[PDB]
């Protein structure tokens, strides 16, 4: 359970396909927001909220 958190927190959706992948967490949510029809702007503009 702890290993799968460290991969999701770090790599997001990559370690489930192959080798792990260093990605910052704030950048993962930018791609996940794009996965629901929302741009990267509202995240970085409201990163604290």
């Amino acid at each position: 359970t702890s290993a799968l958190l460290a991969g999701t927190i770090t790599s997001g959706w990559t370690f489930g396909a192959g080798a792990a992948l260093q990605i910052p967490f704030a950048m993962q949510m930018a791609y996940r927001f794009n996965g629901i029809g929302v741009t990267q702007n509202v995240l970085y503009e409201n990163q604290k909220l």
């Binding site: 359970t1 702890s2 958190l5 370690f15 990163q47």
Partner: protein
């Protein structure tokens, strides 16, 4: 049934000491290294309930 669920990975990942994730606090889900059993706060509640 456990291997198909929990053993979805092939290599153990771990978190860094510098937990900089853009303001997100995963302390209540990450393991407490002080306890004998390395399970998180939320995990410990479920094992007691």
């Amino acid at each position: 049934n456990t291997q198909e669920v929990f053993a979805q990975v092939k290599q153990i990942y771990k978190t860094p000491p510098i937990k900089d994730f853009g303001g997100f606090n995963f302390s209540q889900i990450l393991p407490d290294p002080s306890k004998p059993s390395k399970r998180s706060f939320i995990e410990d509640l479920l094992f007691n309930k």
